Write an enzyme that holds these catalytic residues in place. Sequence first.
Site, mmCIF file in Angstrom:
data_model
loop_
_atom_site.group_PDB
_atom_site.id
_atom_site.type_symbol
_atom_site.label_atom_id
_atom_site.label_comp_id
_atom_site.label_asym_id
_atom_site.label_seq_id
_atom_site.Cartn_x
_atom_site.Cartn_y
_atom_site.Cartn_z
ATOM 1 N N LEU A 15 -8.031 -9.560 14.061
ATOM 2 C CA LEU A 15 -8.121 -8.775 12.847
ATOM 3 C C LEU A 15 -6.862 -8.967 11.991
ATOM 4 C CD1 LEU A 15 -9.265 -5.216 14.139
ATOM 5 C CD2 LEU A 15 -10.767 -7.150 13.588
ATOM 6 N N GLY A 16 -5.734 -9.396 12.491
ATOM 7 C CA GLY A 16 -4.485 -9.547 11.825
ATOM 8 C C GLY A 16 -3.408 -9.835 12.867
ATOM 9 N N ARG A 17 -2.263 -10.237 12.365
ATOM 10 C CA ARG A 17 -1.108 -10.671 13.072
ATOM 11 C C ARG A 17 0.172 -10.260 12.345
ATOM 12 N NH1 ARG A 17 -3.671 -15.571 15.305
ATOM 13 N NH2 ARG A 17 -2.753 -15.908 17.346
ATOM 14 N N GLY A 18 1.285 -10.295 13.033
ATOM 15 C CA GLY A 18 2.593 -9.997 12.459
ATOM 16 C C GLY A 18 3.522 -10.960 13.200
ATOM 17 N N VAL A 19 4.812 -10.930 12.940
ATOM 18 C CA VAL A 19 5.719 -11.862 13.599
ATOM 19 C C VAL A 19 5.605 -11.882 15.111
ATOM 20 C CG1 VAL A 19 7.188 -11.427 11.631
ATOM 21 C CG2 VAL A 19 7.695 -10.278 13.781
ATOM 22 N N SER A 21 3.176 -9.781 16.851
ATOM 23 C CA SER A 21 1.950 -9.107 17.224
ATOM 24 C C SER A 21 0.659 -9.767 16.741
ATOM 25 C CB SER A 21 1.917 -7.676 16.699
ATOM 26 O OG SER A 21 1.443 -7.515 15.380
ATOM 27 N N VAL A 23 -3.453 -8.169 16.377
ATOM 28 C CA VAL A 23 -4.265 -6.963 16.393
ATOM 29 C C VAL A 23 -5.710 -7.419 16.630
ATOM 30 C CG1 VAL A 23 -5.294 -4.987 15.196
ATOM 31 C CG2 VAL A 23 -2.881 -5.555 14.871
ATOM 32 N N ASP A 139 7.812 0.642 4.839
ATOM 33 C CA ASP A 139 7.037 -0.563 4.712
ATOM 34 C C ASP A 139 5.759 -0.310 3.912
ATOM 35 O OD1 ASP A 139 6.806 -3.229 4.776
ATOM 36 O OD2 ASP A 139 6.217 -3.400 6.811
ATOM 37 N N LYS A 141 3.057 -0.823 1.576
ATOM 38 C CA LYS A 141 2.541 -1.936 0.797
ATOM 39 C C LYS A 141 1.035 -2.059 1.096
ATOM 40 C CE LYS A 141 4.036 -5.106 4.157
ATOM 41 N NZ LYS A 141 5.332 -5.899 4.328
ATOM 42 N N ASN A 144 -0.603 -2.616 4.644
ATOM 43 C CA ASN A 144 -0.374 -1.571 5.593
ATOM 44 C C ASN A 144 -1.139 -0.305 5.250
ATOM 45 O OD1 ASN A 144 1.421 -3.301 6.943
ATOM 46 N ND2 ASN A 144 3.208 -2.121 6.152
ATOM 47 N N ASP A 157 0.823 0.903 10.174
ATOM 48 C CA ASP A 157 2.075 0.171 10.349
ATOM 49 C C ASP A 157 3.397 0.957 10.197
ATOM 50 O OD1 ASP A 157 3.885 -1.965 10.972
ATOM 51 O OD2 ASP A 157 3.346 -3.111 9.218
ATOM 52 N N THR A 176 9.379 -6.014 2.785
ATOM 53 C CA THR A 176 9.168 -7.135 1.889
ATOM 54 C C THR A 176 10.025 -6.925 0.639
ATOM 55 O OG1 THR A 176 6.774 -7.365 2.457
ATOM 56 C CG2 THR A 176 7.608 -8.658 0.615
HETATM 57 N N1 ATP Z 1 -6.433 0.044 12.963
HETATM 58 C C1 ATP Z 1 -6.709 -1.166 12.471
HETATM 59 N N2 ATP Z 1 -8.012 -1.390 12.100
HETATM 60 C C2 ATP Z 1 -8.336 -2.634 11.566
HETATM 61 N N3 ATP Z 1 -7.495 -3.593 11.353
HETATM 62 C C3 ATP Z 1 -6.219 -3.334 11.659
HETATM 63 C C4 ATP Z 1 -5.793 -2.152 12.253
HETATM 64 N N4 ATP Z 1 -4.508 -2.148 12.488
HETATM 65 C C5 ATP Z 1 -4.141 -3.321 12.101
HETATM 66 N N5 ATP Z 1 -5.089 -4.182 11.600
HETATM 67 C C6 ATP Z 1 -4.777 -5.384 10.920
HETATM 68 O O1 ATP Z 1 -3.748 -6.163 11.428
HETATM 69 C C7 ATP Z 1 -2.688 -6.351 10.469
HETATM 70 C C8 ATP Z 1 -1.366 -6.233 11.192
HETATM 71 O O2 ATP Z 1 -1.183 -4.860 11.614
HETATM 72 P P1 ATP Z 1 0.277 -4.162 11.510
HETATM 73 O O3 ATP Z 1 0.688 -3.956 10.108
HETATM 74 O O4 ATP Z 1 0.027 -2.829 12.114
HETATM 75 O O5 ATP Z 1 1.088 -5.276 12.242
HETATM 76 P P2 ATP Z 1 2.632 -5.699 12.141
HETATM 77 O O6 ATP Z 1 2.960 -6.829 12.963
HETATM 78 O O7 ATP Z 1 3.471 -4.506 12.250
HETATM 79 O O8 ATP Z 1 2.553 -6.306 10.634
HETATM 80 P P3 ATP Z 1 3.777 -6.604 9.677
HETATM 81 O O9 ATP Z 1 4.087 -8.051 9.595
HETATM 82 O O10 ATP Z 1 3.428 -6.066 8.330
HETATM 83 O O11 ATP Z 1 4.988 -5.916 10.218
HETATM 84 C C9 ATP Z 1 -2.931 -5.295 9.377
HETATM 85 O O12 ATP Z 1 -2.240 -5.572 8.155
HETATM 86 C C10 ATP Z 1 -4.487 -5.237 9.385
HETATM 87 O O13 ATP Z 1 -5.042 -6.453 8.812
HETATM 88 MN MN MN Z 2 5.072 -3.796 10.783
HETATM 89 MN MN MN Z 3 1.975 -4.722 8.600
#
Ligand code: ATP
Ligand code: MN
Ligand code: MN
Length: 281
Positions: A15-19, A21, A23, A139, A141, A144, A157, A176
Site C-alpha cells: 500500500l506504501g513505503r517509507g525509507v 518501512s 505498509v 509531518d 502533508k 500523511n 504518520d 519535507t
Molecule cells: N492505515 C493505512 N491505510 C491505508 N494505507 C495506508 C495506511 N497507513 C499507511 N498507508 C500508506 O503507506 C504510506 C506510508 O505510510 P506512513 O506515512 O505511515 O509511512 P512512513 O514511512 O512513516 O512514511 P514517510 O516517508 O512519509 O515518513 C502512506 O503515505 C499511505 O500510502
Molecule cells: Mn513518517
Molecule cells: Mn508518511
Amino acid sequence: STHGFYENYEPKEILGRGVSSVVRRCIHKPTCKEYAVKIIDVTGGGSFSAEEVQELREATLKEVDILRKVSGHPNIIQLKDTYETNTFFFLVFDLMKKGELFDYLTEKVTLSEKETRKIMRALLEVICALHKLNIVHRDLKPENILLDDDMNIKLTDFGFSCQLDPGEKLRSVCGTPSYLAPEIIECSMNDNHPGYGKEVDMWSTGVIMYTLLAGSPPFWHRKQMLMLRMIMSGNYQFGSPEWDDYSDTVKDLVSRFLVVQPQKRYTAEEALAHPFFQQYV
Ligand SMILES: Nc1ncnc2c1ncn2[C@@H]1O[C@H](COP(=O)(O)OP(=O)(O)OP(=O)(O)O)[C@@H](O)[C@H]1O
Ligand SMILES: [Mn+2]
Ligand SMILES: [Mn+2]
C-alpha cells in the site's frame, strides 16, 4: 512476535513505503477483517550502524506512544495492534480504502473551494485536539492524510511527532522541505535561535490548504537553497490563472497561515473562527 504477527495475520499487497518501512494490507485470521500493517525494519535491511538501530527502535517506540495518546479521535488513525521482534516492528491499523489525499489531489488536479472547506475543517479540528495535548505532528502533508470509505480524512504518520512539556522548543530539522516552517530553517542556521513549537504545524497546514486550491505548492525551486530563502522570506503569491476563481475570504485565510513570525501566525482555533468557516453559525 513475528510468529505472533504471521500467526494472527495473512499479509497482502503493498500500500506504501517509507525509507525504512513497508505498509501492507493484511487479513486478521480469526476475524477475516482487513487492516493495514506498517512494517518497520529497525536494522534498516542490514546497513545502518548499531547506534542508529537504537535511534530507530526508540523512534517507533515514540511513534506508538504518540498514537496511543491520540487514539479515539474520529479523524485520526487508530493503532490497533503492535508486535516487536529484534529487527522488525509491526503497527496494525484500520485500513483506509481510498488512499492518500495526495493521490486524490493528483487525479482531481485541484479541489474546489467547498471541498477544500470540508477537508480543512476536518484537519483543523484534528490539529486543535493535538495542540491541546501539546502534541506537534511535524509531518503534516497530503501523503500523511488518508481517506476512508466515505472520503472522510484520517490523519496518519506520527513518526516525527512529540508531546511538549510547557514552554519547550524543538531544534532538529525533519519533514519535507516544501512544508517546513521558516523558524525550523532559521533554527537550522543558528545555534542561538530559540527553537520552534506547535506553530510549525500551522505553517504546513497553510502549504496544504494552498496546494489543494492551486494544484501546486506556494514555495518551490529546483535548487533547494533558493526555495528555502523563498520560505524564510515568505515570498509567494495568489497568481496567474491559478487563483482567479476563488474568494477573497479563502485567500485571506491562507495568508494567515503563511506568516513567517510564528507569534503572528494563525493557530488552529483562530483558523476555525475565521469567517471562511462561519456560513452556518
Ligand atoms: N492505515 C493505512 N491505510 C491505508 N494505507 C495506508 C495506511 N497507513 C499507511 N498507508 C500508506 O503507506 C504510506 C506510508 O505510510 P506512513 O506515512 O505511515 O509511512 P512512513 O514511512 O512513516 O512514511 P514517510 O516517508 O512519509 O515518513 C502512506 O503515505 C499511505 O500510502
Ligand atoms: Mn513518517
Ligand atoms: Mn508518511
